[PDB]
């Protein structure tokens, strides 16, 4: 009804997805970070093929132009890959390990924008690394490494950028603020050493998610609700009612066409604007749904309930 099938019976264990379009061509290819390695999804006519590009286990994947960034290896490192190079090594290294990223547990992205980004932030043990996009070399460069108070286990790990921020800041948690209107972000600027005590609610209740969707708007999933707030955590005035209660046990959310897409164990819901309608909805108790990537593109995974051993089907939005 809403989801378009990409692949039938995927035997891979997929952790992360990102998109890429071949220059001088039309169709974008899906890049997949899997336990089995990095794959590209090709499609000649009505046949889809998953082609391996990089053999190391991969938990995180990200592309900009013709560069693929990845978190890979049994001992994790941040990598950069030439996508064209990877492809040319499979036609019938181009892959560089990045310094000081050994043991990296997680990477988040900030799409600049006024700050001369994009920016990558990798979490280590007692420190974080900050990488900045450097166009003249089409390369991310490590501009700052700093000691940082990292929770264990990592929960929220996102980059927030307010207007006027020269650099993004690190958000490693979120808490309730004004009941049903605002949130309190746990953001630490680079070089600062802060943490939050007391009512450090052990994982609130269930699913939590912090995702900056606009220069001055952050999407927050917390305590069965989705709030649209400023990067400082204030409610976004203009327009009205920036909160949407979740009817389902929503696990993940995304902002796509200015619309809110929610994902839960047995479905996908679409919501409109600042909070009003409910547009489309996909429900199926026989299928276990799982968000793989968002918002560009949205990639969703299904399996028969409840057979996690089974191969999966892949979809786009």
UniProtKB/Swiss-Prot annotation:
It comes from the Eukaryota. Expressed primarily in hematopoietic organs, including bone marrow, spleen and thymus. Also expressed at very low levels in lung, kidney, mammary glands and small intestine. Residues 11-296 form the CNH domain. Autophosphorylates: phosphorylation promotes ubiquitination by the Cul7-RING(FBXW8) ubiquitin-protein ligase complex, leading to its degradation by the proteasome. Tyrosine-phosphorylated after activation of hemopoietic cells. Belongs to the protein kinase superfamily. STE Ser/Thr protein kinase family. STE20 subfamily. Interacts with MAP3K1. Interacts with FBXW8. Interacts with CLNK (via its SH2 domain). Serine/threonine-protein kinase, which plays a role in the response to environmental stress. Appears to act upstream of the JUN N-terminal pathway. Activator of the Hippo signaling pathway which plays a pivotal role in organ size control and tumor suppression by restricting proliferation and promoting apoptosis. MAP4Ks act in parallel to and are partially redundant with STK3/MST2 and STK4/MST2 in the phosphorylation and activation of LATS1/2, and establish MAP4Ks as components of the expanded Hippo pathway. May play a role in hematopoietic lineage decisions and growth regulation. This is Mitogen-activated protein kinase kinase kinase kinase 1. It comes from Homo sapiens. The chain holds residues 485 to 811 of 833 of the full protein.
């Amino acid at each position: 009804a809403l989801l378009v099938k990409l692949f039938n019976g995927c035997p891979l264990r997929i952790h992360s997805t990102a998109a890429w379009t071949h220059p001088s061509t039309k169709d974008q290819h899906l890049l997949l970070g899997a336990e089995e390695g990095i794959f590209i999804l090709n499609r000649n006519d009505q046949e889809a093929t998953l082609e391996m590009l990089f053999p190391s286990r991969t938990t995180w994947v990200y592309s900009i132009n013709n560069v693929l960034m990845s978190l890979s290896g049994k001992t994790p490192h941040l990598y950069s890959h030439s996508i064209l190079g990877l492809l040319e090594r499979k036609e019938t290294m181009v892959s560089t390990k990045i310094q000081d990223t050994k043991g990296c547990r997680a990477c988040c992205v900030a799409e600049g924008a006024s700050s001369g980004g994009p920016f990558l932030c990798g979490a280590l043990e007692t420190s974080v690394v900050l990488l900045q996009w450097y166009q003249p070399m089409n390369k991310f460069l490590l501009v700052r490494q700093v000691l940082f108070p990292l929770p264990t286990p990592l929960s929220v790990f996102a980059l927030l950028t307010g207007p006027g921020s020269e650099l993004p800041a690190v958000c490693i948690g979120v808490s309730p603020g004004r009941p049903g209107k605002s949130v309190l972000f746990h953001t630490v600027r680079f070089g600062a050493l802060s943490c939050w005590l007391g009512e450090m609610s052990t994982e609130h209740r269930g699913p939590v998610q912090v995702t900056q969707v606009e220069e001055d708007m952050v999407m927050v999933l917390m305590d069965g609700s989705v709030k649209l707030v400023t990067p400082e955590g204030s409610p976004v005035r203009g327009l009205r009612t920036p909160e949407i209660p979740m009817t389902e046990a929503v696990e993940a959310v995304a902002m796509v066409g200015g619309q809110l897409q929610a994902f839960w164990k047995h479905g996908v819901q679409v919501w409109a604007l600042g909070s009003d309608q409910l547009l489309q909805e996909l429900r199926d108790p026989t299928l276990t749904f799982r968000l793989l990537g968002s918002p560009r593109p949205v990639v969703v995974e299904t399996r028969p309930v409840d057979d996690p051993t089974a191969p999966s089907n892949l979809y786009i939005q």
